[PDB]
């Protein structure tokens, strides 16, 4: 499948969920990128203007791709694999309630999974993997990728 063919990757936060403090959205997304830069040669930089490799969007219902959101619950987020245009982009359903903690849906944990997709990972069948298709809260302060996640990403990079 497609991978980024360069080491310096940019992201931009298109818009901010009203569910969270702005600084907390920034930090959750930054931390989620760091999870992956920890285990690859990739470097991620937030840009505030122009065309980024990975655009982070909060939207609800139909939002201009072939992947309409479904209200609260169900689909929480989706992301596109590496490529031009919308490739790499990560979309979060605004009908969820995003948080920094165990309440609602945790943005950081969801973003780790979505960014996995943005980097070219598919889903894992291993329930221990962040790339497992089902969302479940785990303590964010001690979060670690599973062995399966690490072997998956290192099959693509580094
Ligand atoms: O990447 N998007 C998906 O895989 C779609 N989901 C459905 C499968 O039940 S999810 O939104 O539940 C979802 C989103 C992020 C996660 F970390 C887990 C589940
Ligand atoms: Ca939803
Ligand atoms: Ca893109
Ligand atoms: Ca919301
Ligand atoms: Zn979308
Ligand atoms: Zn997924």
**Domain of 79?**
1-158
Q: Kindly state the helix (H) or strand (E) to which residue 90 belongs, with its residue range.
A: strand 90-93
Q: Is 8 exposed, middle or buried (0-12, 13-18, 19+ CB in 10 A)?
A: exposed
Catalytic residue among 114, 118, 131, 152: 114
- The length of the chain, given as a count of residues: 158
Atom of ligand 1 nearest to the CA of 76: 11
φ/ψ of 36, rounded to 5, equals: -85, -35
Number of domains in the chain: 1
For ligand 1, the distance from its centroid to the CA atom of residue 131, given in whole angstroms, is 9
Sheet holding 43-46, edge to edge: 43-46, 8-13, 54-59, 90-93, 77-79
**Distance of alpha carbon 112 from alpha carbon 36, whole angstroms:** 8
Method used to obtain the model: X-ray
Helices 107-118, 147-154: axis angle to 10 degrees equals: 30
Q: Per 3-state DSSP, what percentage of the chain is helix, strand, and coil (rounded to 5)?
A: 25, 15, 60
Atom of ligand 1 nearest to the CA of 113: 17
Nearest to 2 by CA among 110, 117, 132: 117
**Distance of alpha carbon 56 from alpha carbon 52, whole angstroms:** 9
Contact indicator for 112, 35 with CB cutoff of 8 Å: yes
Q: Is 16 exposed, middle or buried (0-12, 13-18, 19+ CB in 10 A)?
A: middle
Helix (H, G, I), strand (E, B) or coil at 117: helix
Neighbours of 64 (CB within 10 A): 10
CATH number of the domain within which 35 lies:
3.40.390.10
Neighbours of 72 (CB within 10 A): 14
* Ligand index nearest the alpha carbon of residue 78: 1
Q: Is 100 exposed, middle or buried (0-12, 13-18, 19+ CB in 10 A)?
A: middle
DSSP 144-156: ---HHHHHHHHTT
DSSP 10-57: EEEE----TTS-HHHHHHHHHHHHHHHHTTSS-EEEE-SSS--SEEEE
């Amino acid at each position: 499948g497609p991978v980024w063919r360069k080491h310096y990757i940019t992201y931009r936060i298109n818009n901010y969920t009203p569910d969270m403090n702005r600084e907390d959205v920034d930090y959750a997304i930054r931390k989620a990128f760091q999870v992956w830069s920890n285990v690859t040669p990739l470097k991620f930089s937030k840009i505030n203007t122009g065309m980024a490799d990975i655009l982070v969007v909060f939207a609800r219902g139909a939002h201009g791709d072939d992947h309409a959101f479904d209200g609260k619950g169900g689909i929480l987020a989706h992301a596109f694999g590496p490529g031009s245009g919308i490739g790499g982009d990560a979309h979060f359903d605004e009908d969820e309630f995003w948080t920094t903690h165990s309440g609602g849906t945790n943005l950081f944990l969801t973003a780790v999974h979505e960014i996995g997709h943005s980097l070219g990972l598919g889903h894992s069948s291993d329930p221990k993997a962040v790339m497992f298709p089902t969302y479940k809260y785990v303590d964010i302060n001690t979060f670690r990728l599973s062995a399966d996640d690490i072997r998956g990403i290192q099959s693509l990079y580094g």
